[PDB]
Design a protein around this ligand. Structure first.
Ligand code: HEM
Ligand SMILES: [Cl-]
Length: 88
């Protein structure tokens, strides 16, 4: 199945010690807000670690799309999924 997270919980994950970001997945039925724990990705993210910290605890879908993240990047995302955010 799936694990749901509340925004009350997501919004706390704002430090480099435990960094979550949320990206809407328009390719999946229901367009879920997928929650990613990118803590262990900070050191290797090609965009750098600072930009991940900027959006920590928030939805970054628009910024993610504006970068034109590649198919390669999107494939690499799945390993960091922890669940989905509660719906709007
Ligand atoms: C798990 C989530 C993410 C993964 C796996 C990821 C992966 C990547 C990859 C592979 C690239 C190289 C370019 C490409 O292949 O398209 C990249 C570049 C970049 N990413 Fe991400 N990214 C993630 C989240 C984010 C988020 C949330 C932002 C916020 C905007 C971001 C900002 C950037 C920027 C700015 C670059 C390009 C840096 C430059 O070329 O100057 N990334 N990312
Ligand atoms: Cl996505």
């Amino acid at each position: 199945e799936e694990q749901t997270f509340s925004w009350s919980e997501i919004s706390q994950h704002t430090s480099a010690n435990s960094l979550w970001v949320v990206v809407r997945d328009k390719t999946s039925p229901g367009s879920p807000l997928r929650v990613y724990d990118v803590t262990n990705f900070q050191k290797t993210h090609p965009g750098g670690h600072l930009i991940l910290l900027k959006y920590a605890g928030t939805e970054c879908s628009r910024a993610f799309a504006a970068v034109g993240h590649s198919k390669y990047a999107i494939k690499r995302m799945s390993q960091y999924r922890i669940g989905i955010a509660e719906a709007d």
